[PDB]
């Protein structure tokens, strides 16, 4: 339900 790209681009 959640793409890995969310974390790849924003998780500090």
């Amino acid at each position, epitope marked *: *339900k*959640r*793409s*890995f*790209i*969310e974390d*790849l*681009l*924003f*998780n*500090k």
Partner: antibody
Amino acid sequence: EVQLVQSGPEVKKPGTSARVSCKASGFTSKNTALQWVRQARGQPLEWMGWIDISNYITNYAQKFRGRLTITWDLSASMAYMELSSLRSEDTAVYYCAAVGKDDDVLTGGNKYFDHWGQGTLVTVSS
Amino acid sequence: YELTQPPSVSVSPGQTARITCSGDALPKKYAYWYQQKSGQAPVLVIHEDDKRPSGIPGRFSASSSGTTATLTISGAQVEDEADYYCYSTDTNDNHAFGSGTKLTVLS
């Protein structure tokens, strides 16, 4: 090289649905998302949503949930946004954009990439 | 999710411009910066808080501390006159662009 080419401008009547296409060529990295961003005249950029084109997982902004669909047609290398129940305030330039990271085999690291279509003016008027 | 920017910033040619971007999730989420000129699509000038894209001049830099991300343009030039938008997300994956800042390079 990568390319993003959007469909031409369209006038739509209130209550109808607008479909905007974005041909995305050359994007083979697994971590690629195609996003849609709109901008009314003199207004800020507004992120509408995106789709992870490797697994088709979508993320729609809260304001557009129930009205917005973002699709990826792998066979045609075509991304689409569909915005239904159009209102006057939906008049804006709609942009597609490809974002993500590449495995940079040259340096051995990763490279963030960021590419934008030319924009599509959707005019909502009866 | 809301990211707050000053509506307008003025800078003398050759001086330093600073554009702030306030968001509650910036301690956990990266900020991106985009430059937009009239009739053009936005152009990335900073990604991941402080990383400078390959084609962006060295006078562009940025940082993030607390709930404030700051874009710094040293030695501002006439070509740097544009609208600037920060961009990030919150802890519930709500993406947002900032309210935007019109940077005038005083002529």
